[PDB]
C-alpha cells in the first residue's frame, strides 16, 4: 500500500526524471539484459545491441506507461488496464522477471539522480514499482 508520503516521494523523483524518462527506460532494459541473461528469452526478435532502435522504443513505451501510473497513482488498476491485459494474455512474461527490471530501473535512477535518491525515496520507489508489477500481473490467472 502506498502511503501519502510514498506518493509524494514518487511524484517528486519522477518529476525530476522529466524528459529523460525514455532514455532511462532503455538503459534499465540494457542493464537487465546484461545482468540477468535469461530475460533475453522474451526478446528473440529484437536487435539487442547497445543503442538499438528497438530497445530505445521499448524504453520510451515503458517510460510513458510509468508516467501515466505516477499521474494516476490513486487509480492504477484502471489506468494500466490495457497493459495488464496485454501482459496476461499475449506477452505472458513470467512474473519473476518484473522484479529484475524493477531492480534495474532503481539502479538506473540511482546512477542519474545523486541528490534525490535518498533512503526514504529509494524505499518509496521500490514500493511503487512492486505495486506497478502487481497490477501488471493481476489478470494472469
Amino acid at each position: 500500500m502506498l502511503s501519502p508520503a510514498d506518493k509524494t516521494n514518487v511524484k517528486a523523483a519522477w518529476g525530476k526524471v522529466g524528459a529523460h524518462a525514455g532514455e532511462y527506460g532503455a538503459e534499465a532494459y540494457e542493464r537487465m539484459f546484461l545482468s540477468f541473461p535469461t530475460t533475453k528469452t522474451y526478446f528473440p526478435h529484437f536487435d539487442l545491441s547497445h543503442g538499438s532502435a528497438q530497445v530505445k522504443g521499448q524504453g520510451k513505451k515503458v517510460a510513458d506507461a510509468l508516467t501515466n501510473a505516477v499521474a494516476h497513482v490513486d487509480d492504477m488498476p484502471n489506468a494500466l488496464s490495457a497493459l495488464s491485459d496485454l501482459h496476461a494474455h499475449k506477452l505472458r512474461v513470467d512474473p519473476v522477471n518484473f522484479k529484475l527490471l524493477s531492480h534495474c530501473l532503481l539502479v538506473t535512477l540511482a546512477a542519474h539522480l545523486p541528490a534525490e535518491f535518498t533512503p526514504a525515496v529509494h524505499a518509496s520507489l521500490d514500493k511503487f514499482l512492486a505495486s506497478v508489477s502487481t497490477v501488471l500481473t493481476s489478470k494472469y490467472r
Partner: protein, 146 residues
C-alpha cells in the same frame, strides 16, 4: 549432485513404480492449467481453453512423455546432471527461448503429482529428496543459458 545414500535410495525406489507416460502427461497438463502463461510455448498444440481440454489434449500428453523421459534418464546420472543435460540446455536457450523459471514451476507441479499419485508413501523425507532432485535438474537445464 550430493545426495545422501538414504536420499538416493528413496528417489530410486519410488521412481521404479512410476508410469512415465501417464505421470508426464499429468504433470505437463497441470503446469498449463495452474500457470496458464506457460501456454505461450504451445500455441500449435490445439485447444487449451479449459482444464478438461488441456488434460485430454493428445499433443500435451505426447510432449509430457518426452519431457519426463529425458528427466528419467537424468535419474540414472545423478552424479553428473550438468554433463547429462548440456545439449538440451543449449537447445532450450538458443532455439526454444524458454525462460528457465518454467523448469522450476514444472519441478514443483511434478512433486504435487507424485504426492497425489502415491498418497501416504510420499512422506516428508521422500519429498525432501525429490525437491533436491528437481532443483538440481532445473539448475542443470539453465546452465548453458547466455
Amino acid at each position: 549432485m550430493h545426495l545422501t545414500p538414504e536420499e538416493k535410495s528413496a528417489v530410486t525406489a519410488l521412481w521404479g513404480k512410476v508410469n512415465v507416460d501417464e505421470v508426464g502427461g499429468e504433470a505437463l497438463g497441470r503446469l498449463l492449467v495452474v500457470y496458464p502463461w506457460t501456454q505461450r510455448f504451445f500455441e500449435s498444440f490445439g485447444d487449451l481453453s479449459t482444464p478438461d481440454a488441456v488434460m485430454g489434449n493428445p499433443k500435451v500428453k505426447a510432449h509430457g512423455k518426452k519431457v519426463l523421459g529425458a528427466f528419467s534418464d537424468g535419474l540414472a546420472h545423478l552424479d553428473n546432471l550438468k554433463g547429462t543435460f548440456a545439449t538440451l540446455s543449449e537447445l532450450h536457450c538458443d532455439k526454444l527461448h524458454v525462460d528457465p523459471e518454467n523448469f522450476r514451476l514444472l519441478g514443483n507441479v511434478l512433486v504435487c503429482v507424485l504426492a497425489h499419485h502415491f498418497g501416504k508413501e510420499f512422506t516428508p523425507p521422500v519429498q525432501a529428496a525429490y525437491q533436491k532432485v528437481v532443483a538440481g535438474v532445473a539448475n542443470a537445464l539453465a546452465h548453458k543459458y547466455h
